Amino acid sequence: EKSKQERMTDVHNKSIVGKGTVWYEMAYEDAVKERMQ
């Protein structure tokens, strides 16, 4: 009825079908700094 999270899960499955455990999970700024440093 309200706050249905179906569309988000659907577009996430269309973008990434295999929801495997993320080997590398990090913030954007941290990744940019690691690329710099």
What type of residue is 21?
Answer: T
Angstrom distance (rounded) from CA 26 to CA 18: 19
37: contact with another protein by CB under 8 A: yes
Q: What is the DSSP letter of 24?
A: -
For residue 1, the minimal CB distance to another protein (Å) is 17
- Contact flag: residue 16 with another protein (CB under 8 A): yes
User: Which of residues 1 and 34 has its CB atom nearest to another protein in the complex?
Assistant: 34
Whole-number Å distance between alpha carbons of 14 and 31: 25
Residues that bind another protein in the complex, under the rule CB under 8 A: 5, 7-8, 11-12, 15-16, 23-24, 28, 31-32, 34-35, 37
